[PDB]
Paper text:
An X-ray co-crystal structure of anhydrotetracycline in complex with Tet(X6) was determined at 2.2 Å resolution. A clear non-protein density was observed in the substrate-binding cavity, consistent with the size and shape of anhydrotetracycline. The anhydrotetracycline binds to Tet(X6) in a substrate-like orientation, placing the A-ring close to the FAD and the D-ring close to the C-terminal bridge helix. The isoalloxazine group of bound FAD occupies an ‘IN’ orientation in the Tet(X6)-anhydrotetracycline complex structure, as observed for the anhydrotetracycline-free structure. The carboxamide carbonyl oxygen at the 2-position of anhydrotetracycline forms a hydrogen bond with Arg213. A water molecule serves as a hydrogen-bonding bridge between the carboxamide substitution of anhydrotetracline and Thr59. In addition, the Phe224-side chain stabilizes the bound anhydrotetracycline through π-cation interaction with the 7-dimethylamino substitution of anhydrotetracycline. The O4 and N5 atoms of FAD form H-bonds to the keto-enol moiety (O12) and nearby hydroxyl group (O12a) of bound anhydrotetracycline. These interactions contribute to orienting the anhydrotetracycline scaffold for hydroxylation by a putative C4a-peroxy-flavin reactive intermediate at site C11a, with at an appropriate short distance of ~5.6 Å from the C4a of FAD-isoalloxazine heterocycle. The Tet(X6)-anhydrotetracycline complex shows the FAD cofactor bound in an ‘IN’ conformation that is distinct from the ‘OUT’ conformation observed for FAD in X-ray structures of type 2 TDases complexed with anhydrotetracycline.
Numbering used by the authors: 23 to 393
The structure:
């Protein structure tokens, strides 16, 4: 009854925002999602996602999509390999435990979430740029100059969100590591040496402070990521330009001098690199207790954390599960009370996940790390 005659808008059609939309919409709520992506066919860059049984799968199960997720997800083994190509350990998948945390492509996950929403729930090509209160309505202004209204706004537009101020003045901060991600489409044909090395499993390798991760089977593409402590020089004078593939390739081949040629072939065969400093949106400071109208944040917009403990999406899907339940479960007598309890709970499991992810980051990028 809290949401009677309330227009609820979600900013961002990521995994967290769409799951939130599904959880509210299946209860009869009036939901609109504004997404900056041009249209539903836009590719989502990055690796696969694993939904954990305790958190991410609960959100999907609660939304009625758990089996759809299982149908599209792939169980993946993991090989720990040294820099010379020697497999050190092989953690294969139990057929019994294959539904524990199978990997799903990001576009496939988005498609299942979109198909569970009513038609035209997501409004595409809508980049929110301004959010201001007008009496009892939020005013949403978009990059294309259009404007919309809402009674409740849920910020779900990712870790670099610029529309958080009414909730918190906390700024995104850097942790000291750097990630370079890339895709090699049709790896059986285009990087056969490294594809053979993965041998149907995800690959993980650490050497000289440089970590390499690879998934050979991300919907017919090999996705891999290279992570390291950000060089101290890049803070004063950096010489790698990430708009120039050739400069990125040159830098990586220097870093990977001692690695087996199959790794260097992987680097030389990459057409585009995405480089980004690891960031955190810290939960050290409490959010604002005085807000002009109901608003909150979920997902990376709430607790962006380093992606070294596999907590990112699962923490966000927990946000959507707890917040959607609080708004519909009859336990609270105001939207604001329901939001406040959500944030109390989220600061608790959010703070723990961030502390874990920082612990893993510090350990993994020490020169003594060995998996
Ligand atoms: C390199 C890397 C690897 C990772 N690996 C994993 C992993 O293996 N497992 C895992 O669980 N997590 C992983 N994560 C973290 C995980 O991807 C995030 O926690 C998760 O994607 C957060 O989802 P979200 O919906 O909150 O935000 P996002 O996934 O960023 O989605 C936000 C959405 O909002 C849209 N948007 C942004 N600004 C606007 C705007 N102004 N107006 C409208 N729409 C807007 C974006 O286009 C996007 O669709 C990784 C992160 C990184 C950087
Ligand atoms: C360290 C780690 C990683 C991942 C991960 O899921 C995870 C976990 O679930 C528990 C503990 C540790 C990790 C990744 O999935 C992954 O996203 C990944 O597979 C990966 C990749 N396939 O390229 C990465 O790039 C890695 N990172 C730099 C973002 C990260 C590494």
């Amino acid at each position: 009854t809290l949401l009677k005659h309330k227009k609820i808008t979600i900013i961002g059609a990521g995994p967290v925002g769409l799951t939130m939309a599904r959880l509210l919409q299946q209860n009869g709520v009036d939901i609109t999602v504004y997404e900056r992506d041009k249209d539903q066919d836009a590719r989502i860059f990055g690796g696969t996602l694993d939904l954990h049984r305790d958190s991410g799968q609960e959100a999907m199960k609660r939304a009625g999509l758990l089996q759809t997720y299982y149908d599209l997800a792939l169980p993946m083994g993991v090989n720990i390999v040294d820099e010379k190509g020697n497999i050190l350990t092989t953690k294969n998948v139990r057929p019994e435990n294959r539904f524990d945390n199978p990997e799903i492509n990001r576009n496939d996950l988005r498609t299942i979430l979109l198909n569970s929403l009513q038609n035209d729930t997501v409004i595409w090509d809508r980049k929110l740029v301004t959010l201001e209160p007008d009496k009892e309505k939020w005013i949403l202004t978009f990059e294309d100059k259009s404007s919309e209204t809402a009674d409740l706004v849920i910020i779900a537009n990712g870790g670099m969100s610029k529309v958080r101020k009414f909730v918190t003045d906390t700024e995104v901060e850097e942790t000291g590591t750097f990630n370079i991600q890339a895709d090699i489409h049709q790896p059986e044909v285009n990087c056969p040496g490294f594809f053979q090395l993965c041998n149907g499993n995800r690959l993980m390798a650490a050497h000289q402070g440089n970590l390499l991760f690879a998934n050979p089977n991300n919907n017919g593409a090999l996705h891999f990521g290279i992570s390291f402590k950000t060089p101290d020089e890049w803070k004063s004078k950096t010489r790698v330009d990430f708009q120039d593939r050739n400069s990125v390739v040159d830098f990586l081949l220097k870093k990977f001098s001692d690695w087996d040629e199959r790794y260097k072939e992987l680097i030389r065969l990459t057409s585009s690199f995405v480089g980004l400093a690891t960031r955190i949106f810290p939960l050290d400071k409490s959010w604002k207790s005085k807000r002009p109208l109901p608003i909150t944040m979920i997902g990376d917009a709430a607790h962006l954390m380093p992606p070294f403990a596999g907590q990112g999406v699962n923490s966000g899907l927990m946000d959507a599960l707890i917040l959607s339940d609080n708004l519909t479960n009859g336990k609270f007598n105001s939207i604001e009370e329901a939001i406040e309890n959500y944030e109390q709970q989220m600061f608790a499991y959010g703070r723990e996940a961030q502390a874990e992810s920082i612990i893993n980051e510090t350990e993994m990028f020490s020169l003594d790390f060995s998996f």
